[PDB]
């Protein structure tokens, strides 16, 4: 989006060599960050996926979209849940819960959301990952 | 408001935007962006089924410690 992919002056293999030796040191294995950058890679390609819009109501991701496949094998999850529930969602009345198509800039407005919640959450587990490995078994008499 | 204290500004030009001011600074504010930031449409069913989701590390990223 911003057109401007590369930073004047910033290698990025070094910035990544700097990223793993400190969560290393910091005492996070390297399956950890695997996962966070197959959670990337899988947020990336979620990112591409097109809509067909039945109509302003509902709207059905168009049948084996590859996106979503690369999205749910990154996620290790099924592929026929994840369609249903970004073509579809469920409403809760006072007293039914029945299932009704999104529509598709809502759907779109929906993994938008999605991906950034995931995004929200992995920082926010990494933060507490960080956490634990700072965090001092003897009780601090104070800080700054 | 109703123009009760100075700090709030009403904007004739363009009723899409209010204008607050600030013992710093006083500045305008459009008001598209507002609603569509501050309303996320999340269901609990929706959050029940993306903790069966069989990412085994998903259910965790949602987990509540309370």
Known sequence: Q???????GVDDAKEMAHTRQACTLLGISESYQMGIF???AGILHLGNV????RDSDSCTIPPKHEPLTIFCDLMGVDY???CHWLCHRKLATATETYIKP????????????????????????????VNQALHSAVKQHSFI | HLNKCALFEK????????????????VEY???GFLEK????????????????KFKMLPELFQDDE
């Not at chain 1, 911003?2 to 004047?8: D, L, Q, R, T, Y």
């Not at chain 2, 501050?38 to 989701?53: A, G, H, P, W, Y």
Request: glycine content about 4%; hydrophobic content about 40%; overall charge positive.
């Open chain 1, 2 to 8: 911003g057109g401007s992919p590369m930073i004047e």
């Open chain 1, 38 to 40: 197959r959670i990337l």
């Open chain 1, 50 to 53: 097109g809509f067909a819009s």
């Open chain 1, 80 to 82: 026929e849940e994840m």
């Open chain 1, 102 to 129: 999104i529509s598709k800039l809502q759907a779109t407005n929906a993994r938008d959301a999605l991906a950034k919640h995931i995004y929200a959450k992995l920082f926010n587990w990494i933060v507490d990952h």
């Open chain 2, 11 to 26: 904007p004739r030009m363009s009723n899409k935007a209010f204008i607050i001011k600030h013992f710093a600074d006083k």
């Open chain 2, 30 to 32: 459009q008001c598209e």
């Open chain 2, 38 to 53: 501050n309303k996320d449409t999340v269901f609990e069913e929706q959050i029940k089924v993306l903790k069966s989701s």
